[PDB]
Amino acid sequence: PSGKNILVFGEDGSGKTTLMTKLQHGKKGRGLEYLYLSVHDEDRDDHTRCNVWILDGDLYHKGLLKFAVSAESLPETLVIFVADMSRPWTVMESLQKWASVLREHIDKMKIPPEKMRELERKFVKDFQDYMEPEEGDNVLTHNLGIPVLVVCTKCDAVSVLEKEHDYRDEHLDFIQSHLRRFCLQYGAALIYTSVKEEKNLDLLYKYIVHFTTPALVVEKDAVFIPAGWDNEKKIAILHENFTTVKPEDAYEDFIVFLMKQQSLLAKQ
Amino acid sequence: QEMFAWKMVVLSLPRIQSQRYQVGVHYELTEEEKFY
Known part of the structure; x- marks a missing residue:
C-alpha cells in the first residue's frame, strides 16, 4: 500500500495526548506533533505508516498544515476532528472552526493541481454513493468532501455533565443529534471515545482508508454513528422528545491641574 | 520502505521558538489565560 495520513486536531489539549497514548509523550501545547502508527493489516504488520499530525492552537498553523499535507497525499487523509464533551460550546464552535480551517486549506493548497480537482470531486461524489450502503436518501451536504x-x-x-449543568436528556440529546447532523452535513460519521473505553475508532479508520462495526444508540452514553447511518428523519425524532425542534436560541443556553483650578476659583 | 522523511525535513525546524510575537507590546503576553 501507499502512505496513509491522519490529521488530528486538538482543541487546547482536550485529552489528545492521552488519546494518542491509548492507541500505542511529553505534552501538546505548541503544535505539529508528528506521530507514527502501526495498525494490523488483517494478517501481519505490513508497515501501515499512517502519519498522524497533532495540530493545536491558532497562532499561524497554516504553515504547519503545509508541512503536514503533501500534493499526492490528499486521498488517504483521515482528519480527526477532536472536541471534548466537557465543554459543549467548545464542540459546537470548534467543529465549525476546524471545518473552516479545512475549507481554507482546500481553498489555498488544493487549488494548484487542475486534474486533482476534477478527479477528487467525482471521487467524493462516488465515495458518498458507497458510504450509505453496507451499513448495519439525500441530506444537506456542504461543499467540503474528503474521507x-x-x-x-x-x-x-x-x-x-448531568451533575454540573445538564441534569436532563435535553443537553446530551442536543449534542448527540446536532453532532449527528453536523457529521451528516459534513459528509462524515461520528465515533465517540473515552478513557480506556469505546474502542471503535480503529475499525472505521481502517475500514475507510482501504473490520466492520455496527451502530449503538441503545445505551445513549456510548453513541457510535457509522458511515451510512444518517438521514433527515431520525435526527428530527432525536431532538423532538421534550427538546425544541431545531432551536436557534438554545446555543446561548447550553454555551497641578484640578487642584490648581480649584484654588484659583476659590481665590477669584 | 520507511525512507520518506524529506518532506518533513524540507521545513522541519524553521520556527522552533516562534511563540513570542505579541505585536511588540500586547500588555498580556501569554499564549493562554489564567483562572478567575
Whole structure:
C-alpha cells in the first residue's frame, strides 16, 4: 500500500495526548506533533505508516498544515476532528472552526493541481454513493468532501455533565443529534471515545482508508454513528422528545491641574 | 520502505521558538489565560 495520513486536531489539549497514548509523550501545547502508527493489516504488520499530525492552537498553523499535507497525499487523509464533551460550546464552535480551517486549506493548497480537482470531486461524489450502503436518501451536504470522521472526547462523563449543568436528556440529546447532523452535513460519521473505553475508532479508520462495526444508540452514553447511518428523519425524532425542534436560541443556553483650578476659583 | 522523511525535513525546524510575537507590546503576553 501507499502512505496513509491522519490529521488530528486538538482543541487546547482536550485529552489528545492521552488519546494518542491509548492507541500505542511529553505534552501538546505548541503544535505539529508528528506521530507514527502501526495498525494490523488483517494478517501481519505490513508497515501501515499512517502519519498522524497533532495540530493545536491558532497562532499561524497554516504553515504547519503545509508541512503536514503533501500534493499526492490528499486521498488517504483521515482528519480527526477532536472536541471534548466537557465543554459543549467548545464542540459546537470548534467543529465549525476546524471545518473552516479545512475549507481554507482546500481553498489555498488544493487549488494548484487542475486534474486533482476534477478527479477528487467525482471521487467524493462516488465515495458518498458507497458510504450509505453496507451499513448495519439525500441530506444537506456542504461543499467540503474528503474521507472524514469526527471523534469526540470525554464521553465517559455522563454523570459529571448531568451533575454540573445538564441534569436532563435535553443537553446530551442536543449534542448527540446536532453532532449527528453536523457529521451528516459534513459528509462524515461520528465515533465517540473515552478513557480506556469505546474502542471503535480503529475499525472505521481502517475500514475507510482501504473490520466492520455496527451502530449503538441503545445505551445513549456510548453513541457510535457509522458511515451510512444518517438521514433527515431520525435526527428530527432525536431532538423532538421534550427538546425544541431545531432551536436557534438554545446555543446561548447550553454555551497641578484640578487642584490648581480649584484654588484659583476659590481665590477669584 | 520507511525512507520518506524529506518532506518533513524540507521545513522541519524553521520556527522552533516562534511563540513570542505579541505585536511588540500586547500588555498580556501569554499564549493562554489564567483562572478567575
